[PDB]
Enzyme design. Structure first.
Site, mmCIF file in Angstrom:
data_model
loop_
_atom_site.group_PDB
_atom_site.id
_atom_site.type_symbol
_atom_site.label_atom_id
_atom_site.label_comp_id
_atom_site.label_asym_id
_atom_site.label_seq_id
_atom_site.Cartn_x
_atom_site.Cartn_y
_atom_site.Cartn_z
ATOM 1 N N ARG A 55 0.832 -1.196 0.000
ATOM 2 C CA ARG A 55 0.000 0.000 0.000
ATOM 3 C C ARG A 55 0.865 1.244 0.000
ATOM 4 O O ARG A 55 1.647 1.482 0.925
ATOM 5 C CB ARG A 55 -0.902 -0.057 1.249
ATOM 6 C CG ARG A 55 -1.973 1.005 1.384
ATOM 7 C CD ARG A 55 -2.917 0.687 2.565
ATOM 8 N NE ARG A 55 -3.841 1.789 2.847
ATOM 9 C CZ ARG A 55 -3.679 2.684 3.821
ATOM 10 N NH1 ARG A 55 -2.629 2.623 4.631
ATOM 11 N NH2 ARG A 55 -4.552 3.674 3.965
ATOM 12 N N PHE A 60 1.747 10.671 1.364
ATOM 13 C CA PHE A 60 1.391 10.173 2.687
ATOM 14 C C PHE A 60 2.442 9.180 3.223
ATOM 15 O O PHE A 60 3.246 9.532 4.099
ATOM 16 C CB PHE A 60 -0.003 9.539 2.617
ATOM 17 C CG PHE A 60 -0.486 8.947 3.920
ATOM 18 C CD1 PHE A 60 -0.068 9.455 5.144
ATOM 19 C CD2 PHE A 60 -1.354 7.860 3.909
ATOM 20 C CE1 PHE A 60 -0.498 8.893 6.351
ATOM 21 C CE2 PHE A 60 -1.788 7.284 5.105
ATOM 22 C CZ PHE A 60 -1.350 7.811 6.335
ATOM 23 N N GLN A 63 3.595 1.524 2.912
ATOM 24 C CA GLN A 63 3.354 0.537 3.951
ATOM 25 C C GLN A 63 3.766 -0.848 3.487
ATOM 26 O O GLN A 63 3.501 -1.221 2.346
ATOM 27 C CB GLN A 63 1.859 0.541 4.307
ATOM 28 C CG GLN A 63 1.445 -0.456 5.375
ATOM 29 C CD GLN A 63 -0.046 -0.439 5.649
ATOM 30 O OE1 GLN A 63 -0.789 0.382 5.103
ATOM 31 N NE2 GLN A 63 -0.498 -1.358 6.498
ATOM 32 N N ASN A 102 -0.994 -0.682 12.833
ATOM 33 C CA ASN A 102 -1.658 -1.497 13.868
ATOM 34 C C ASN A 102 -3.142 -1.610 13.604
ATOM 35 O O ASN A 102 -3.609 -1.213 12.548
ATOM 36 C CB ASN A 102 -1.383 -0.956 15.281
ATOM 37 C CG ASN A 102 -1.833 0.489 15.477
ATOM 38 O OD1 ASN A 102 -1.100 1.318 16.026
ATOM 39 N ND2 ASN A 102 -3.028 0.796 15.035
ATOM 40 N N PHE A 113 5.275 1.559 8.257
ATOM 41 C CA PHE A 113 5.136 2.520 7.165
ATOM 42 C C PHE A 113 6.245 3.574 7.232
ATOM 43 O O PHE A 113 6.815 3.861 8.295
ATOM 44 C CB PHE A 113 3.743 3.183 7.107
ATOM 45 C CG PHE A 113 3.364 3.972 8.347
ATOM 46 C CD1 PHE A 113 2.887 3.330 9.488
ATOM 47 C CD2 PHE A 113 3.404 5.366 8.342
ATOM 48 C CE1 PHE A 113 2.442 4.058 10.606
ATOM 49 C CE2 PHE A 113 2.961 6.105 9.454
ATOM 50 C CZ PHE A 113 2.477 5.454 10.587
ATOM 51 N N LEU A 122 -1.396 10.971 13.325
ATOM 52 C CA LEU A 122 -1.052 9.609 13.760
ATOM 53 C C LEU A 122 -0.328 9.593 15.097
ATOM 54 O O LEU A 122 -0.114 8.521 15.678
ATOM 55 C CB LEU A 122 -0.221 8.904 12.676
ATOM 56 C CG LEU A 122 -0.926 8.816 11.317
ATOM 57 C CD1 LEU A 122 -0.026 8.200 10.260
ATOM 58 C CD2 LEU A 122 -2.228 8.025 11.458
ATOM 59 N N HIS A 126 0.369 5.652 16.747
ATOM 60 C CA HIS A 126 1.342 4.790 16.080
ATOM 61 C C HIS A 126 2.742 5.059 16.650
ATOM 62 O O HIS A 126 3.165 6.215 16.793
ATOM 63 C CB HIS A 126 1.290 4.979 14.559
ATOM 64 C CG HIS A 126 -0.038 4.626 13.967
ATOM 65 N ND1 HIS A 126 -0.297 3.405 13.389
ATOM 66 C CD2 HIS A 126 -1.216 5.301 13.955
ATOM 67 C CE1 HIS A 126 -1.572 3.332 13.051
ATOM 68 N NE2 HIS A 126 -2.154 4.473 13.387
#
Lengths: 165, 11
Positions: A55, A60, A63, A102, A113, A122, A126
């Site tokens: 992904r 951004f 991942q 997660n 990521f 985040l 995270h």
């Protein structure tokens, strides 16, 4: 003590792109850093080698880390299936930050990521545990194959990985 | 949205 440096050699549809090295913050999140380090050397009998970045969303992050189901839903830690959120001392301050994916509180596995922009939303959810040390240009090249929905236009794999220091 | 989850990826 010195923070460990780990590397990934990235390939695009089997063609080598380049090496990205990361510094892991073992001095602040020793348990989370160790998990990533051991998964990069493959010393427990399983790890990131041969897995892909499933992904990628331009602007951004990228991942990866699912070496089990190989579809974005799997992976596991060296401590068993999942482990706790160690601490949230570090923040998603800009490009290059390495953080854990997660499924809510205390569900860290192997997925992670690499941020390509500051992602403050985040923070506190995270666990940040490292940063790109060298090869940020390779991460930018990777971003080129992603899309708004995350699907990549070419298969991006971790061709090789290990510990440098 | 812009989340990084494992299992149920949200908008």
């Amino acid at each position: 003590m010195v923070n460990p440096t780990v590397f990934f050699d990235i390939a695009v549809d089997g063609e080598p792109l380049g090496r990205v090295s990361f510094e892991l913050f073992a001095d602040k999140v020793p348990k989370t850093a160790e998990n990533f380090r051991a998964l990069s050397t493959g010393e427990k009998g399983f790890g990131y080698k041969g897995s892909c970045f499933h992904r990628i969303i331009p602007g951004f992050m990228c991942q990866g880390g699912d070496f089990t189901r190989h579809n974005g839903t799997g992976g596991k830690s060296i401590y068993g299936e999942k482990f706790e959120d160690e601490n949230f001392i570090l923040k998603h301050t800009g490009p290059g930050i390495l953080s854990m994916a997660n499924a809510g509180p205390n569900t860290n596995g192997s997925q992670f990521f690499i941020c390509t922009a500051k992602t403050e939303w985040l923070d506190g959810k995270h666990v940040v545990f490292g940063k790109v040390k060298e090869g940020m240009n390779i991460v930018e090249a990777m971003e080129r194959f992603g899309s708004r929905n995350g699907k990549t236009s070419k298969k991006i794999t971790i061709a090789d990985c290990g510990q440098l220091e | 949205x812009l989340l990084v989850t494992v299992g149920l990826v949200l908008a």
